[PDB]
Design a protein around this nucleic acid. Structure first.
Lengths: 58, 185, 51, 159, 222, 171
RNA sequence: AUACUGCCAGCUGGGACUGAGGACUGCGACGUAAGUCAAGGAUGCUGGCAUAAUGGUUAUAUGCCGCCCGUCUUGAAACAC
RNA sequence: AUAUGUAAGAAGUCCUUGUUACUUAAUUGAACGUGGACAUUUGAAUGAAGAGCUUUUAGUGGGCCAUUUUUGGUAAGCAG
RNA sequence: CCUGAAAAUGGAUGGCGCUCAAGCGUGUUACCUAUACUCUACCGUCAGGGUUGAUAUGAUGCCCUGACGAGUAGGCAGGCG
């Protein structure tokens, strides 16, 4: 009793029912996967600039 | 006949005429449809929509959240509006003299507000005093802090609280959750 | 309640277009033109009849 | 059985080029990449480290990470009925800048210049681009250009 | 508080003033159409006299009618028809001709009959089957008031103003054409004139660019 | 349909490298103007390196028969495709206008070779007016001096189904 | 001149289907003007019957059409159950 | 050729750089920022019949046919 | 067009029949008719709206407007027993 092995028939229609809307983009994308040396310096520099901005407008 | 670009006979996707059979809630809804229709102020449209909401979409609002809202600069004398239940909070030791209009007040919340000196008001009295929602501040409780919502979107590498009854060692802390036993999620 | 179509119902026609009245009065549908007989070049007809 | 390896059916895709084999000239290493740059991906068959998968050959992405000899590229890969975020760690041999955005930056600079000139004078800048319009009326003469009559030719063997 | 006749008389006076503006605007539009037509004729005659050939300006506006039904349409032509708002058979739309528009029409040629409409057929289409889109609702024009209320921000204050913006493709052609609901036409009254429709107009069929014959087709269908 | 003859003059799109191209012309027998332009571009694509996108049409003018109520001999050189190959042929018609000569040529080729419109190129139509240049017998037959013939067996079409006398085919 | 084509907010007739709405309000036209109108949906005049006459139900006849349901199945009226 | 990635702006463009344990020979850069110049044309077309976002659950998981591309086979109302 | 051209019940351009066809090829019109298209009425569904009079009407009431309607497996809703 052989049967059908594979088909991509109807797959694109199924996808396009409620399908291929583009990815939702965000301001401030995630920093995951970034160089951790850069990430360390970014933590330190953001701390510093927050302190400076507080001093400027306390 | 027609190449339809959308689904036909599609409902609104939003509530109207709340599911509750509360006669007094229906009275409040009737009053605020009148207001939202004949006043052109966005506040009454918002309040009508919020009156339609279900219980889990009307999370309780603590008097601590009320105080944190009134701490906003220039918001000290605004009328706090909660479409839902205002609950007490014993993690705060002082409460200001605000006017809070809410659907329901717990005994503790009402007593705390009254002792602080402000007033607990129903939404119909709020409508009478501020028909256009003047000088008001709407507070909403935390919606995505339920226990049900922490199991939403569960899957590999999601970090979303498995649906479990007993918790502890030997209850899903094994193969598939640590590198010592096979893999990690 | 009921759509009355212009191009008939001269009432609806005039309601939509005040200029319909004077178009009809001055018969601008059948309007003559001034005659100035600019003569075409011989090469044009030569090319046209070129067998 | 069937074979679907990493470099499956890449026989011609990663072929170097005609008369462009051998070492890689140094401009590809002197080029610098910053986070947010748009880069086309075209794998170099000669360099086998940091090679993109054959899916990402000819795909354009955005830099999110710069390392010693590599960049991290964000790409939107179509999976099923949605787009997923993919982060490739590729080498600058396979990476190259994209001119698709650079044309747009040139246009935005020109738009700013025209905007400044408008704030000066008000001469109907018409910043917006437009598609090709239908051709306007023109007058073509026959002086020294009398039309040549053409007719279909008879059929002949030619063989 | 009485408001019996004073406000009514003021409204009547304002309406009379608006009718006056429409009257002079329509007279100017007629003068403009006539002058353009006579200048085209005179330019052709002058080029012929001078020994040249006067090339017509390529037509800036087309009318497209969907000729095929809504069954067995490939995805790309189907999407293009949906974008041109020809979602049903015999539905028509005005289209400003550019390169992008021309490629759109070329994609859906087997399913439409289009061509270069004339002032007469644009005026007849808007007068008889003119429906506007107001709050996503198809309401008959039937009044200069609704067109003024929905397009007076662009200066279009009457049905003949809208007609003029459609024919002499104006700066606000996109907005006027979008305000115009897709034209719901009947089958041609005398028939299609061909035994089979779904061949090109060149090959004895119906679909494709019947350049100026779209006027005859649409006037039969209207 | 009723064929009309058109002169169609078109050129290549003028370029700044060299403006005003050579401005070619053709005579095209077509049902209307759209088909006339289409056939012009067909034959120009066959002849020169041009297409509708790469060129433009500067003139279309339908041409009338000089004397559409006088009988002339028309030699028509055609080429056509059969089911096997391409053949050049030469026929001739007695007619009053070139348009009717071409229409009857199209009917003739359809009837005698099953050649449809698409597979026929009218190479040339030449109005020949002298005898001894008419080569076909089926034309020299009617150029006979003082020609007269009868129409035997006249069949008269009746409107009513039933007739009350036996018919006559006399003329 | 005629033909062919285009236009007319050109004119003049013969037919058919429909008459939804139910005080007014609106947009317009008419010597602008008191008022009238074909202008946000049929009124006016008249006749016969007032009863199985119309109509409903039912049985038949006639014209056209109509395979046996349920099921499993890619596919059932199936010589599948 | 047809299909295919990206871009066509306000989360944009340009400026003495404020922070840093990163980087630089180096207030060199890198990243993130304060502040500053820029709408009624905020930067092609067409459409948009609302956009986005969750939760939960049914049936299905034997398919078959047509045009075109195409494999095995002499071929098949064959198999893929 | 003819020869090439042979299969089993009697037999199928659908049939009768048709020969300057009612055949073949190609032009021109006229005409016929789908549950399609246009316009109208009515039903339902969806959507957008209007509406606080002390009055005799229960505001999921009274209204205006537009667009839609195929359906197995299946889901939900409003109802009948």
């Amino acid at each position: 009793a052989k049967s059908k092995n594979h088909t991509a028939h109807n797959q694109t229609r199924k996808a396009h029912r409620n399908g291929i809307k583009k990815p939702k983009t965000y301001k401030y994308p995630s920093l995951k996967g970034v160089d951790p040396k850069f990430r360390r310096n970014h933590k330190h520099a953001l701390h510093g600039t927050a302190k400076a901005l507080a001093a400027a407008k306390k | 006949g027609i190449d339809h670009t959308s689904k036909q006979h599609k409902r609104s996707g939003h509530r109207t005429a709340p599911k509750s059979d509360n006669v007094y809630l229906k009275l409040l809804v009737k009053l605020y449809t009148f207001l939202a229709r004949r006043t052109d102020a966005p506040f009454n449209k918002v309040v009508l929509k919020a009156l339609f909401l279900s219980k889990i979409n009307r999370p309780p609002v603590s008097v601590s959240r009320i105080a944190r809202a009134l701490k906003q600069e220039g918001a000290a004398n605004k009328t706090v509006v909660v479409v839902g239940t205002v609950t007490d909070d014993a993690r705060i030791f002082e409460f200001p003299k605000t006017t809070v209009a809410a659907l329901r007040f717990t005994a503790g919340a009402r007593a705390k507000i009254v002792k602080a000196g402000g007033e607990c008001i129903t939404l119909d009295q709020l409508a009478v005093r501020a028909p256009k929602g003047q000088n008001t501040l709407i507070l909403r409780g935390p919606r995505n802090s339920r226990e049900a919502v922490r199991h939403f979107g569960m899957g590999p590498h999601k970090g979303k609280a498995p649906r479990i009854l007993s918790t502890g060692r030997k209850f899903e802390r094994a193969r598939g959750r640590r590198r010592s036993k096979g893999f990690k999620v | 309640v009921l759509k009355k179509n212009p191009l008939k119902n001269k009432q609806v026609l005039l309601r939509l277009n005040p200029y319909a009245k004077v178009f009809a009065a001055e018969k601008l549908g059948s309007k003559k033109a001034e005659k100035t007989g600019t003569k075409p070049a011989a090469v044009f007809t030569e090319t046209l009849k070129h067998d | 059985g069937k074979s679907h390896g990493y470099r499956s059916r890449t026989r011609y895709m990663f072929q170097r080029d005609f008369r462009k084999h051998g070492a890689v000239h140094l401009s590809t290493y002197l080029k610098v990449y910053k986070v947010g740059d748009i880069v086309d991906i075209k794998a170099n068959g000669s360099i086998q480290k940091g090679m993109p998968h054959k899916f990402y050959q000819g795909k354009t992405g955005v830099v999110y990470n710069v390392t010693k000899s590599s960049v991290g590229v964000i790409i939107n890969k179509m999976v099923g009925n949605r787009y997923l975020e993919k982060r490739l760690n590729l080498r600058v041999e396979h990476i190259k800048h994209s001119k698709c955005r650079q044309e747009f930056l040139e246009r935005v600079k020109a738009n700013a210049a025209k905007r400044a000139e408008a704030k000066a004078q008000g001469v109907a800048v018409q910043l917006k681009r437009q598609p090709a319009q239908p051709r306007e009326s023109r007058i073509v003469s026959t002086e020294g250009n009398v039309p040549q009559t053409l007719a279909p030719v008879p059929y002949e063997t030619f063989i | 508080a009485e408001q019996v006749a004073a406000e009514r008389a003021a409204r009547k006076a304002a309406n009379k003033e608006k009718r006056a503006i429409i009257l002079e605007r329509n007279a100017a539009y007629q003068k403009e159409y006539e002058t353009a037509e006579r200048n085209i004729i005179q330019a052709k005659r002058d080029a012929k006299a001078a020994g040249s050939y006067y090339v017509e300006a390529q037509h800036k506006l087309v009318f497209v009618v969907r000729i095929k039904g809504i069954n067995k349409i490939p995805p790309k032509p189907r999407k293009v028809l949906q974008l041109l708002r020809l979602t049903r058979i015999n539905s028509g739309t005005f289209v400003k001709v550019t390169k992008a528009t021309l490629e759109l029409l070329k994609l859906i040629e087997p399913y439409v009959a289009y061509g270069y409409p004339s002032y007469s057929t644009i005026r007849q289409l808007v007068y008889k089957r003119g429906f506007g889109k107001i709050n996503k609702q198809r309401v008959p024009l039937s009044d200069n008031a609704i067109i003024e209320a929905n397009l007076g921000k662009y200066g279009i204050l009457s049905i003949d103003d809208l007609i003029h913006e459609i024919i002499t493709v104006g700066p606000h052609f996109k907005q006027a054409n979008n305000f115009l609901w897709p034209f719901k036409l009947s089958n041609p009254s005398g028939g299609w004139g061909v035994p089979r429709k779904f061949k090109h107009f060149i090959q004895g069929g119906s679909f494709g660019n019947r350049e100026e014959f779209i006027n005859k087709l649409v006037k039969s269908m209207n | 349909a009723h064929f009309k003859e058109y002169q169609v003059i078109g050129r290549r799109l003028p370029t700044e490298s060299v403006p005003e191209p050579k401005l070619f012309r053709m005579r095209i027998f077509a049902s209307n103007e759209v088909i006339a332009k289409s056939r012009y571009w067909y034959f120009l694509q066959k002849l020169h390196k041009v297409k509708k996108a790469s060129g433009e049409i500067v003139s279309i003018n339908q041409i009338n028969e000089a004397h559409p109520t006088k009988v002339k001999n028309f030699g028509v050189w055609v080429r056509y495709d059969s089911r096997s190959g391409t053949h050049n042929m030469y026929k001739e018609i007695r007619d009053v206008s070139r348009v009717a000569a071409v229409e009857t040529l199209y009917q003739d080729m359809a009837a005698r070779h099953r050649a449809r419109f698409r597979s026929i190129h009218i190479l040339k139509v030449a109005e020949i007016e002298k005898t001894a240049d008419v080569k076909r017998q089926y034309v020299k037959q009617f150029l006979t001096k003082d020609l007269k013939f009868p129409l035997p067996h006249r069949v008269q079409k009746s409107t009513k189904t039933f007739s009350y006398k036996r018919p006559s085919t006399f003329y």
